[PDB]
Design a protein around this ligand. Structure first.
Ligand SMILES: [Zn+2]
Length: 202
């Protein structure tokens, strides 16, 4: 049994900022502070204007990234779970949920812009972090790339759900997890865009 009257629900994922990639300079912009984030997570009602391809998103416990590709805002299951996302009309249910791929998605919010999936086959990639660093990554397999310059795992914490891009700025994948030893990240695991395309039926 249980005390049914006191049963709580997890809040929505809330967009709290974006990574601006539109000019020649990448930078993180915050669009909501912590108090507003908490309120918005509970109501699921977010009237803020959305712009851009890469959103900074938060739950009650974590902050990470989400990336629009082909009109779907994608992120990692390990960050978002099965949560709704806050929107101007209230909570929006996930359109895709795949724990096996560590992948979830919602319909892309009005005002967002989407990346296009890469078709170039290039192995020279670029990872965009939550701090708007653009880090060169050499692709090493279907789902892995090496950092040209290794760094402490702290640097990548909170970047899950962000994009890996080809030289032409098309989406190659979604960052999933760092590969590290003794706290040093030398590589990254990612969800390849073809996996998203198959999920979408595109
Ligand atoms: Zn490409």
């Amino acid at each position: 049994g249980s005390h049914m009257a006191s049963m709580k629900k997890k809040g929505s994922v809330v967009i709290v900022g974006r990574i601006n990639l539109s000019g020649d300079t990448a930078y993180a912009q915050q669009t909501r502070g912590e108090e507003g984030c908490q309120e918005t997570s509970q109501t699921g009602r977010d009237k803020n204007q959305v712009e851009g391809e890469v959103q900074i998103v938060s739950t009650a416990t974590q902050t990470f990234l989400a990336t629009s590709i082909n009109g779907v805002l994608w992120t990692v299951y390990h960050g978002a779970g099965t949560r709704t996302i806050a929107s101007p009309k209230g909570p929006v249910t996930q359109m895709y949920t795949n724990v096996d791929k560590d992948l979830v998605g919602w319909q892309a919010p009005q005002g967002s812009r989407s990346l296009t999936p890469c078709t170039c086959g290039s192995s020279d990639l670029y990872l965009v972090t939550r701090h708007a660093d653009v880090i060169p990554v050499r692709r090493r397999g279907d789902s892995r790339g090496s950092l040209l310059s290794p760094r402490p795992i702290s640097y990548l914490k909170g970047s899950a759900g962000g994009p890996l891009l080809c030289p032409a700025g098309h989406a190659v994948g979604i960052f999933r997890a760092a590969v590290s030893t003794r706290g040093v990240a030398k590589a990254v695991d990612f969800i390849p865009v073809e996996s998203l395309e198959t999920t979408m039926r595109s």
